[PDB]
Amino acid sequence: MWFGEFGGQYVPETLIGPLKELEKAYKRFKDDEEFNRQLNYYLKTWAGRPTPLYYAKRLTEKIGGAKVYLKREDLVHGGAHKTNNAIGQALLAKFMGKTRLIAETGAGQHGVATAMAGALLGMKVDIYMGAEDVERQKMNVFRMKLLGANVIPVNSGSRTLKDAINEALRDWVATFEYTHYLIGSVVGPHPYPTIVRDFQSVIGREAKAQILEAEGQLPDVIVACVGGGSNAMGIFYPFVNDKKVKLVGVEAGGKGLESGKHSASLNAGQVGVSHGMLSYFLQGQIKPSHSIAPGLDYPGVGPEHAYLKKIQRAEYVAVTDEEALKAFHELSRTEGIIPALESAHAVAYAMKLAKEMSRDEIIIVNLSGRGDKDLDIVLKVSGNVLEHHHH
Amino acid sequence: MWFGEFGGQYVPETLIGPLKELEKAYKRFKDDEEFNRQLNYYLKTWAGRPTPLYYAKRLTEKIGGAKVYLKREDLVHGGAHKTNNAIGQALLAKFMGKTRLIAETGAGQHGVATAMAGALLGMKVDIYMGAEDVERQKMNVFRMKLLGANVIPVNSGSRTLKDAINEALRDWVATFEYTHYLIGSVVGPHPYPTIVRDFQSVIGREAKAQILEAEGQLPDVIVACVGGGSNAMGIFYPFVNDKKVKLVGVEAGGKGLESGKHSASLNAGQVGVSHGMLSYFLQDEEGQIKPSHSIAPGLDYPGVGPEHAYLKKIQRAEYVAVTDEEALKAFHELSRTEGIIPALESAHAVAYAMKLAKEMSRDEIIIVNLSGRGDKDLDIVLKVSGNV
Ligand SMILES: Cc1ncc(COP(=O)(O)O)c(CN[C@@H](CO)C(=O)O)c1O
Ligand SMILES: Cc1ncc(COP(=O)(O)O)c(CN[C@@H](CO)C(=O)O)c1O
Ligand code: NA
Ligand code: NA
């Protein structure tokens, strides 16, 4: 239910019924032999798990400090970690007898992942997406439609991710008998922060096994970008009880923390109740975020991160648009890996942190997705660079 | 060198030395423990091998015939099988002491794969690409630039893949002491058809282990699309000596085999010589190499590898064609039914597998090589199919 003070289930009575049935089913099926037979089968044969853990040898040597490893969620089917949660919850929906999936999306990656998982399991898919996001993500919207999903543009409110979540919750209240609302991050009312984190925890379990195989020891630091916080919780959670392992979440610093154009909810947000949970939200109404990374757009953050921040188990930092863009280019040129702009925030901070650390020490960076989806954004900025040759 | 009467080394004397040195180096490193340790390390940790073998259960049940399995080369780093060969040859080049990679590309996929492998290994990369292809593939050209590679637009001739290969060979003759020419398909003079097939054979070795693990038996048919022929050779080669396993290569039927707008070199072409090999080519009465057409950008090489010409000759493999229309329907079908957006090249294989499955029995098994993912093709499909 709660993570310290944070999280909870602060919703109207119309949502209590749907959420209670979801909790019961989840407790029912999470450790069921037949459910896990199918989930592991799809994660293996369809999604391509396990993803590798890659030693960024050239990057490590260039910086001249700590060893930089990359957990390669960019290689998951769909090109992002979102698929892990999409498969888990969609299979849960199938086991519950649901025939329809709905989901919110901002960047379009979770919408694509949900569309993919729904197509896989023969379920109807409607994706709620803010009209301003629909406009910025033409090709992800087209991907969703190719996969058999319908994209419902949300014209209410600010026409962004927060509004898409609002419309999806309204839909689910009416249609929960046959519809499962597939939330895409560790956010919303209980049991969603737990369910999404549980379905992303495979990342950390693989990473722990892989780093023990590669280095004979646990990492000194784990760095992941934090939007809502699902990829970060996925890689963090299996290391939480290893006190050796430092955990660093990287939020979108945008145009600077002083500018008020960022998505650093943990850093500069206010504690409040929204979307059925107590957590940090940026504001005194909740406002749309800003980041070069379309995926770091949720105005709040998961309550388990708010908890880990308060008990000082994880540190949370910010990286600017400029810094993330530099890391996008650096990783591409140095390791031949084009990262998602979300993931590039984590790469950017890991590079700064590696410089200050010892050559015997180990950083794992969660590479939450690949950057094919971001090429239009990077082309637009790269085309506008003045004297690109000598700079 | 020869696959029956096909293959050879039809190059000027200036390239015999470089090809001899490559052949010597390859024979040495192919079975070297350290070379193979490093290659397998990069294929595992960087490229993400093994790729899974996926049972397309919904597609199988919709068609109501044979079991359709998909070898998921769409999940290799870069999104296509081209990476397997790019790493192999780039590592070979590094072991030979070379500092520079050059490569041809038409669709841009091999160009990207070469740029990725060169970036990984700290080598300079120049990609030769026909100006007509540069214009069609601006995002792949941009990918190559992001990876640190220099794309050289080829303005001579027809300004397509055949002209890029000619310029690449021109470069290599002058720069071979420090440059490796990283050919992207099972084409060119010996030893390239052999080397590329060997570096793609991992696909078939995995697929064989995976199908035995899944079903306890070898497949009845293997279906792969055939451009130059590398993804097909990769999945075919380990099953060649298994007599019961049928091999089906799928060429681009384009607007139709009678339309004169296709890339079916085995089905409709003539025996000829180009790019250092004796093989099947689409060539006119003047002996000149015709333009290829296909909705799939990657099925644009106007010939085919000599090992496929051989397998056709001895009737070990069958070669068929699938039209633009059929490939496009399969692109949509797979996306909707299995949640996998395939490359348009791979969709040719999917299209034929769907036709072939319907005729066959429910107990029988088909493996389709899904050579790449379709993210690169979304603009093409948006234009041709339209928005929804
Ligand atoms: C590749 C990638 N990496 C990271 C994130 C951040 O989300 P997380 O903090 O839940 O991992 C996103 C979010 N993307 C969400 C929100 O916009 C979506 O609807 O697609 C992403 O697409
Ligand atoms: C995804 C995919 N699948 C299949 C093929 C066909 O080539 P093959 O027959 O060598 O596998 C290609 C070729 N693509 C080549 C030739 O245009 C390139 O330079 O990129 C491809 O990109
Ligand atoms: Na946020
Ligand atoms: Na051809």
From Swiss-Prot, chain A:
Cofactor(s) the record lists: pyridoxal 5'-phosphate
Recorded metabolic or biological pathway in which this protein acts: Amino-acid biosynthesis; L-tryptophan biosynthesis; L-tryptophan from chorismate: step 5/5
GO cellular component: cytoplasm
Catalytic activity field: (1S,2R)-1-C-(indol-3-yl)glycerol 3-phosphate + L-serine = D-glyceraldehyde 3-phosphate + L-tryptophan + H2O
Keyword Amino-acid biosynthesis in record: yes
KW Amino-acid biosynthesis (keyword) present: yes
The organism's place on the tree of life at top rank: Archaea
Enzyme Commission (EC) number: 4.2.1.20
InterPro entries, per the entry: Trp_synth_b_CS (IPR006653), Trp_synth_beta (IPR006654), Trp_synth_beta/beta-like (IPR023026), TrpB-like_PALP (IPR001926), TrpB-like_PALP_sf (IPR036052)
Gene Ontology MF term list: tryptophan synthase activity
UniProt keyword list: Amino-acid biosynthesis, Aromatic amino acid biosynthesis, Lyase, Pyridoxal phosphate, Tryptophan biosynthesis
CDD domains per the UniProt record, alphabetical: Trp-synth_B (cd06446)
Modified residues (N6-(pyridoxal phosphate)lysine): K82
NCBIfam families found in the cross-reference section: trpB
Its biological purpose: The beta subunit is responsible for the synthesis of L-tryptophan from indole and L-serine.
Subunit structure: Tetramer of two alpha and two beta chains.
Membership in a protein family: Belongs to the TrpB family.
Name of protein: Tryptophan synthase beta chain 1
Organism placement in taxonomy: Archaea, Methanobacteriati, Methanobacteriota, Thermococci, Thermococcales
Gene: trpB1
